[PDB]
Amino acid sequence: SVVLTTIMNADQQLRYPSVGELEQIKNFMEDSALRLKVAKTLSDANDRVVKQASAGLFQRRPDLNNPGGNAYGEKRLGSCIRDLGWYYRLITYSIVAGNNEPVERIGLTGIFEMYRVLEVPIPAMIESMRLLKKEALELLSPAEAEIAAPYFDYVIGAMQ
Amino acid sequence: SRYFKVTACIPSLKRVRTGRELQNTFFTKLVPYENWFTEQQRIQKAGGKVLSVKLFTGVQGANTGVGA
Amino acid sequence: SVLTKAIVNADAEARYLSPGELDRIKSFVASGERRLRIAQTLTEARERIVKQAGDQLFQIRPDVVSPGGNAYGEKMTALCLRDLDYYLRLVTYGIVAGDVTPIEEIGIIGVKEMYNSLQTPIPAVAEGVRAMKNVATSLLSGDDAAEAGFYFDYLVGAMQ
Amino acid sequence: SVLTKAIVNADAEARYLSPGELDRIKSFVASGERRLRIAQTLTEARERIVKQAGDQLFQIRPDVVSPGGNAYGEKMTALCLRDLDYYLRLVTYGIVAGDVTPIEEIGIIGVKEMYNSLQTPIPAVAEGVRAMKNVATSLLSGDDAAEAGFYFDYLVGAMQ
Amino acid sequence: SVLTKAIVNADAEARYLSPGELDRIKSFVASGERRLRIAQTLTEARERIVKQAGDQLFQIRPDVVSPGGNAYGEKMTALCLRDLDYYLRLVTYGIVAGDVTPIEEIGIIGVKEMYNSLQTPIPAVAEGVRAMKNVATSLLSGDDAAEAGFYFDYLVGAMQ
Amino acid sequence: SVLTKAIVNADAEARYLSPGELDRIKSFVASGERRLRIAQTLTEARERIVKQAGDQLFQIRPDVVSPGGNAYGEKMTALCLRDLDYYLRLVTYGIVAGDVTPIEEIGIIGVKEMYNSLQTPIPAVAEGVRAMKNVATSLLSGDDAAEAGFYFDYLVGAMQ
Amino acid sequence: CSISATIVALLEMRKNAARLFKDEADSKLVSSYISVVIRALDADRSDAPADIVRPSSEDRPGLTLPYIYKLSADSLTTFKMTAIYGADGRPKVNLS
Amino acid sequence: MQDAITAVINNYDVQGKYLDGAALDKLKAYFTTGAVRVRAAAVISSNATTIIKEAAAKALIYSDLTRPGGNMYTTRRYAACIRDMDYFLRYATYAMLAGDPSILDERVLNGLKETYNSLGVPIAATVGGIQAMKEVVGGLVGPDAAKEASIYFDYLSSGLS
Amino acid sequence: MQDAITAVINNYDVQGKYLDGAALDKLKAYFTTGAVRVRAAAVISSNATTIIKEAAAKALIYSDLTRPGGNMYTTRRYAACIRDMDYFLRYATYAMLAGDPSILDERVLNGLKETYNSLGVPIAATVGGIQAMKEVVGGLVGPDAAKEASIYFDYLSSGLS
Amino acid sequence: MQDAITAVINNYDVQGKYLDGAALDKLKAYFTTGAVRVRAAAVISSNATTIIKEAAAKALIYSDLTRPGGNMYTTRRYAACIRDMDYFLRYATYAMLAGDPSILDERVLNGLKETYNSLGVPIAATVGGIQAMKEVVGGLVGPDAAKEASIYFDYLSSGLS
Amino acid sequence: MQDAITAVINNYDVQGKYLDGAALDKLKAYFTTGAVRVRAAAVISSNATTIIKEAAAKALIYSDLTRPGGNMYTTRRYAACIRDMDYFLRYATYAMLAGDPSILDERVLNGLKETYNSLGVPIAATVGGIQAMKEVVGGLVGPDAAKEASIYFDYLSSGLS
Ligand SMILES: *[C@H](C)[C@H]1/C(=C/c2[nH]c(/C=C3N=C(/C=C4\NC(=O)C(CC)=C4C)C(C)=C\3CCC(=O)O)c(CCC(=O)O)c2C)NC(=O)[C@@H]1C
Ligand SMILES: *[C@H](C)[C@H]1/C(=C/c2[nH]c(/C=C3N=C(/C=C4\NC(=O)C(CC)=C4C)C(C)=C\3CCC(=O)O)c(CCC(=O)O)c2C)NC(=O)[C@@H]1C
Ligand SMILES: *[C@H](C)[C@H]1/C(=C/c2[nH]c(/C=C3N=C(/C=C4\NC(=O)C(CC)=C4C)C(C)=C\3CCC(=O)O)c(CCC(=O)O)c2C)NC(=O)[C@@H]1C
Ligand SMILES: *[C@H](C)[C@H]1/C(=C/c2[nH]c(/C=C3N=C(/C=C4\NC(=O)C(CC)=C4C)C(C)=C\3CCC(=O)O)c(CCC(=O)O)c2C)NC(=O)[C@@H]1C
Ligand SMILES: *[C@H](C)[C@H]1/C(=C/c2[nH]c(/C=C3N=C(/C=C4\NC(=O)C(CC)=C4C)C(C)=C\3CCC(=O)O)c(CCC(=O)O)c2C)NC(=O)[C@@H]1C
Ligand SMILES: *[C@H](C)[C@H]1/C(=C/c2[nH]c(/C=C3N=C(/C=C4\NC(=O)C(CC)=C4C)C(C)=C\3CCC(=O)O)c(CCC(=O)O)c2C)NC(=O)[C@@H]1C
Ligand SMILES: *[C@H](C)[C@H]1/C(=C/c2[nH]c(/C=C3N=C(/C=C4\NC(=O)C(CC)=C4C)C(C)=C\3CCC(=O)O)c(CCC(=O)O)c2C)NC(=O)[C@@H]1C
Ligand SMILES: CCC1=C(C)/C(=C/C2=NC(=C\c3[nH]c(/C=C4\NC(=O)[C@H](C)[C@H]4CC)c(C)c3CCC(=O)O)/C(CCC(=O)O)=C2C)NC1=O
């Protein structure tokens, strides 16, 4: 989280938190009251947004469910949908957390090294998270959309 | 003048180094007293744990003979 | 500043600006108006603040203005008041920047060596900064007084 | 001492003692008896030197013995003269050793941090050591006084 | 020399010279005229030392002046005597200097590789140096003989 | 040997076996027949080669058989012939191994300290190795003789 | 690109290069070399093994390097010595 | 590196003055232009890769740089681009977030001409590629935020050439 | 290391559970009190050396520790003990800010016990110094952050003992 | 490390004995199988990526290891497990080509089991993966070198267990 | 390291009183033993190689250890043993000049047994070589330094065994 990111820098430089660092640590909490319902709203759709994004993604890329495709079969499709659910859970975790910490530390550092022995399309995950961000914002208002858009941008900005 | 004889393991969890990542992940080595603190802080910063530390070289009294 | 501390931090990893960093930069630009107003209010009352702080300092530590004192004499006292004005200027710079980065480079790094060479009481200078903090917080509303005094306490802690 | 310094210097190069190194040891062992006489003289005159050094220090720097001084009262002044006694003992140890290794390992490394924590004037302690040197110079022969003054000046420079 | 060693170590540790180093400098400057007299005696007796050194070396190791010997031939023996004169001059340099930096930089660093290049017996050269040590100590009083013997033994140990 | 060096270098490169190193493997396995043939061809005449090499070494270097030399005495001559037999074992080891790895580990590293402590002529031992080169080459075919001569000349360089 | 279309064309090129040669070792060589292209093409994900990121500090920028760029280099000979197994020890030891 | 906030403080500290009306007006202008910059930074991010591909197709590819002899002829030379680029983005996205040339002169555009001269690397081509990226980002970002992004891209191109 | 927030995230990611009412209750309970944590951390940072001074004066010095035969004897050992004092204070502040002793376990207590055993450090004296730290810090920060500051000093004392 | 030839050479050097008939038979026994070792090593090195891809499908994936709470869970741990598998395959190739587990004991097994104990990695899972790689290698290499390839994987599994 | 003067300094420093008449007597005794100490050290440094030669000829060479199947076998191992012998001689001279075996313990005697057991180096033969150097120095140096030379020579043997 933000506290972890600040304390890591402080301990790396061997010093207390800074006079501009506490101003950010306090501003990270005052919007937490609003943000709690923002990440909450995506929480009770978690088995629905991914379910719809399957219908947004494997018709866009039909080779994912074609004989030369990686997601042929009901169980193979289930794996891709479970991966989408994992990414949705992680992005919600980071939304509740602050900085990129929850997603980067768990399911972002080593995507290419995983898929290197997995044969799963990174350019397909690009559109997958594009559609996830596309469908997860209309549940929110524009005020919440402004507090949700950058949190969605990091996946398609990192895997690239 | 004295060297601590210690053993420890340090895992790298940000880069996944991909060549002979075994000798640099578990080691025993004599480290000087003046450099022991900076050596041991690195293991804690990276995330590994120190398994044991030993005086080895010097006596507990200190006073004269400490310098080097 | 906050912008420098945020952009260069997301440049040491070879990534774009973090979705966690497309925030507190935001609160900084939001509170920039209040920061500018507070800095202007401190700047208008620079002479009164310096004069009253020097008065309080010379009462509380009268040994400095004695014959065996570093600041004994009319022009050695003028130099002490000039140093107090310098630190008030640095505090205003820190307030506008939103971080103690500029004040740190301008008037803190090596201050121990400079004052030891000149044979000046660093605790006396710190007490002078505290008196300046009291006089400054006497001229401001509670929130703005706390905001200015937080930087003042940074100066007091650093000169130590 | 000289022996440990020469031995460490030879051991670092992994070679036997050079002729100049042996000449140094021979000169030191030949001159040891004068150092022993210096040590016994300073030992039997330890209390008078400490008292006169305290008197000179309190005359030179009234601020240390003052309402706000570091040594105000009886136990504070007792501790100051006690520290002077420790430094006299360290000077005798250095004189008998012929070098400054025991003095360095006992009373100078970390003394800056210790005296900063205690808020004792380091220049005041240096003035006390200088007064100790002035007192000790009045109880020795000229060559012997110079020999002791070398280590006294070493302590003065080290507390700088 | 001793001055070079003390100054080099003080510069390497970035500090002023220690009292022990100053004492060694004082002893070195005290022994200067004695060292000069010893060197003058050796340089006056340079040729006789070389001649009987050659005689002792040839008596001990006649194989070197044998057909399979490195110095077989009158001009080869002349070169051996010239190396002998070189090492005697280096010994005089070391004696006046008070230590072994000039001897080291002139005649031991790389001497192993050079004599391997020339296919010459290093133990034979060391035995010749020992013969020089005997002949030189035969012309000097006991203390000065020991002082020259230290440098001769240093040369023998270095050629090893 | 060849495989050891290939694997060590490939591992230091941090990659699989290159086709180059695979080439040296596939050709060493083929040429092991000729290497072994050279092996027992030298092994059958091990003692005669050593004896003839010793004889021509004695005739070429009368200086080793001298009052200062190490060869005066039938016991010393036997000790030298045993060293020669040791080195013919070493050269046949290197011939069978294809690389000089065992020979270096067994009889060249520290041989300088060996023969300096024992006071033995290293150039004389090199001449004995050359004599042994001639004796071994006299009983082998030209290509095979040159193949053994590579290791013999490497030994001649090694004691240098 | 039709990747499957190109891989089959590569297979046809490999086999047809095989038909020219009499398989002494030279027809095997061409097949092995052209097989390298297809094998190091297919997977989609072992290809492009990330960018080697050089992390920097607050004073200088952090850098990145394409993997293929350093894969065509001199391959970085390194020296590493393994000997913590034991100061006092138990394992195979020996001199290595 | 420097932003507007730090630049005003630095050139008001060298002369030892408090922040006057002009300095407050400059800081006021930056603070008022502090939201479109943040929005355009996020817009540049995510759509970065398509921006690079469009710029490459518009300027670099379909020219001398791709045929034999070019400096983008084979793969890994095509790969050193997209790289090379992603800088000139990344940077100047930093510039249009902490708006000042500064960063572009200290980290990216400094000795780059020397490096390109020692490594081939057609400077005219790599500046035409910069202008293509400028056009595509001006298209993607918006009407008003197309400017100052055009400013930093023009600064980069002019400094390089 | 972890704080209250990332501790909740990891504790739910281990079984793959989305954030529920109980988890959001824990996060709310952490968020409602951290402002007092910020004020207490600022006060501790501003008064770091003074706290070490009073803690040493009350618990360590004026004893046999500073005399010959003591562990704190000589300026080198005195500076070492005060640096350890400062390190304990700073890591206690980090733990109180994060709301979790994970950083204390990972970077403070790991190896400190047998390290002090091999060095001869009096663990009772260090514990007394830590409690003097906690007393001074509780005096300074006030009721708002007193127990939150003191719990991690007690954690350090219990880990050492 | 040592190969067959190096091991026999050292075993004769320690006795100071010339190469005898038995040493000749041992060397010839190594030499007659040299070519098939090169062929099997080339077969492994050519398609090692596909080998590891197939081996990952039989032993570890699609299980609780890849789920939350599993050792191989998360991107970093998954990539580390596959890197370890590649390490095992490459060093098994080296051991097979040298005809001696000495390199495996020197540079793979040493410290490995206590390292996995400290990290919490499943030694049984690693053993299963090593064996599955062993069947894949034995199937690919064919009857000519299947047993020879499999013996070193067996050595790795037995050393780990 | 701690010489005689430093040892007396530490002995009075841990108890915290000034130098006494007993300390004066001890320092005077060590000053009296200075010149013969320097002369003996100079003689040993002069004849370092000869001492190793006689010690080897008396206890090391021409035996089973100097044949195949020995730890002394191979020039590298023999050079390592002779370098260790020179180490013993040099550190014995250092301790002889210092007056205290602290150098002998920390720089030499510390360890030197677990390493020897791990390597397989015989220890009885090493002790015999140390005693061989003992009689060699006994003849090389005068009887004034013979006893003090012998006690430091026996110290290494006692520590090793
Ligand atoms: C994979 C089948 C299993 C698995 C493995 C796993 N390993 C690590 C971490 C390390 N692996 C190594 C390995 C080696 N070092 C060497 O020198 C060699 C031979 C040359 C090897 C094989 C080491 C030392 C580490 C630690 C340092 C590092 O991370 O690089 C991890 C990561 C553990 C962590 O997160 O700290 C994992 C997951 N996991 C499974 O589930 C499989 C059973
Ligand atoms: C006297 C001339 C000056 C002075 C001194 C002063 N010292 C203290 C307190 C302490 N001084 C020491 C000193 C040492 N410990 C060591 O190991 C050595 C090396 C041999 C020394 C010199 C220590 C340990 C203390 C702490 C108390 C204790 O000994 O237990 C004080 C008291 C400070 C306080 O805050 O109480 C003072 C005043 N003061 C002057 O004005 C002179 C310049
Ligand atoms: C003969 C051509 C030359 C020569 C030799 C000579 N050697 C010795 C004594 C020894 N030589 C060795 C040799 C080795 N030990 C090893 O491990 C190896 C590597 C395989 C070698 C070559 C040893 C150990 C000894 C010592 C006795 C022993 O083996 O136990 C002597 C005797 C010296 C003495 O003082 O008695 C001699 C003479 N002499 C010449 O003139 C030739 C140049
Ligand atoms: C692309 C449109 C053009 C082109 C470029 C090209 N560049 C290289 C190699 C390098 N480019 C850089 C660049 C930078 N380093 C920095 O730090 C920065 C700013 C932060 C920049 C812009 C460097 C240093 C190199 C050399 C080292 C490396 O490759 O990382 C190449 C490769 C040249 C080669 O093959 O050796 C190429 C091809 N090529 C084109 O056709 C365009 C004109
Ligand atoms: C002070 C209250 C007490 C005391 C302490 C003391 N400590 C040392 C030496 C060390 N202390 C540490 C400490 C740490 N390493 C870590 O990682 C952390 C947390 C991040 C800590 C606190 C270490 C590593 C050392 C050894 C290296 C060094 O000295 O820096 C000493 C010195 C012992 C000696 O002289 O050899 C002392 C004296 N002493 C007291 O009297 C107090 C009770
Ligand atoms: C989905 C849009 C795309 C896709 C995906 C796909 N994934 C798999 C299999 C796995 N995916 C994972 C993922 C993770 N492990 C982790 O630790 C994390 C971080 C939280 C993730 C995201 C794993 C472990 C597997 C392997 C199976 C397992 O659960 O252990 C498949 C199946 C591949 C197969 O060979 O069966 C697929 C198809 N495929 C597409 O086409 C989409 C673009
Ligand atoms: C000699 C009398 C006997 C003997 C010795 C022998 N030693 C080694 C190897 C080593 N010896 C050391 C010793 C030290 N390292 C130090 O730092 C110190 C004190 C400063 C000592 C005494 C060590 C660490 C090694 C290993 C590294 C090296 O070889 O230099 C060997 C070689 C063993 C091998 O081949 O690996 C030998 C043979 N052998 C005898 O037979 C003698 C009785
Ligand atoms: C020797 C190794 C090597 C190759 C092969 C290579 C190929 C190569 N093909 C390219 C483009 C291109 N390549 C193709 C098409 C195809 N590509 C194929 O291999 C098929 C035969 C065909 C599809 C059936 C197209 C259409 C483009 C233009 C870019 C685009 O697709 O948008 C480019 C980018 C530059 C350009 O536009 O010319 C590269 C790097 N460069 C190399 O260094």
Topology (SSEs and partners):
This is part of a larger assembly, with 1 copy of chain A (160 residues), 1 copy of chain B (68 residues), 4 copies of chain C (160 residues), 1 copy of chain G (96 residues) and 4 copies of chain H (161 residues).
Chain A: H1 2-12, H2 21-30, H3 32-43, H4 46-57, H5 74-97, H6 101-107, H7 111-115, H8 122-136, H9 142-145, H10 149-158
Helix pairs in contact in A: 3-5, 4-5, 4-8, 5-6, 8-10
Chain B: E1 3-9, E2 26-32, H1 33-46, E3 49-52
Chain C: H1 2-7, H2 25-44, H3 46-60, H4 74-97, H5 101-107, H6 111-118, H7 122-137, H8 142-158
Bound molecules: phycocyanobilin (8 copies).
One phycocyanobilin (CYC) sits between chains F (64, 69-71, 76, 79-80, 83-84, 86, 106-107, 118, 120-121, 124-125, 128) and K (61-62, 66, 73-75).
PDB class: photosynthesis
Keywords: phycobilisome, light-harvesting complex, photosynthesis
Entry title: structure of bundle-shaped PBS with both long rod and (ApcA2B3ApcD) trimer
Number of domains of chain H: 1
* Distance, first to last CA of chain H: 21 Å
Count the helices of chain A. How many? 10
Structural class of chain A: mainly alpha
Largest sheet of chain A: none
**Outline of chain H, from the CA principal axes?**
elongated
Condensed summary:
Chain A is mainly alpha-helical and 160 residues long.
Throw out a few tags for this protein.
part of a larger assembly, 11 chains, C: 160 residues, mainly alpha, Globin-like, globular, H: 161 residues, 9 helices, elongated, binds phycocyanobilin, Phycobiliprotein ApcE (chain G), bile pigment (chains H, I, J, K), thylakoid (chains H, I, J, K), methylation (chains H, I, J, K), electron transport (chains H, I, J, K)
Can you give a write-up of this model?
The structure is cut from a larger assembly and holds 1 copy of chain A (160 residues), 1 copy of chain B (68 residues), 4 copies of chain C (160 residues), 1 copy of chain G (96 residues) and 4 copies of chain H (161 residues). Chain A has 10 helices and no strands. Helix content of chain A is 69%, strand content 0%. Chain B has 68 residues and is of the alpha+beta class. Chain C has a single domain, classed as Globin-like (Orthogonal Bundle), CATH 1.10.490. Chain C starts with a helix and ends with a helix. By secondary structure, chain C is an all-alpha fold. With 96 residues, chain G is mainly alpha-helical. Chain G contains 3 helices and 2 strands; from the N terminus they run ααββα. Chain G has a two-stranded antiparallel ribbon. In chain G, α1 packs antiparallel against α2. The longest helix of chain G is centred in the first third of the chain and has 18 residues. Chain G is flat, with a radius of gyration of 23 Å. The interface between D and K is medium-sized, with 30 and 32 residues. Bound molecules: phycocyanobilin (8 copies). One phycocyanobilin sits at the interface of chains A and J. Chain G: It is found in: Cellular thylakoid membrane. Chain G: Belongs to the phycobiliprotein family. Belongs to the phycobilisome linker protein family. Chain G: It comes from Gloeobacter violaceus (strain ATCC 29082 / PCC 7421). Chain G: This is Phycobiliprotein ApcE. Chain B: It is found in: Cellular thylakoid membrane.
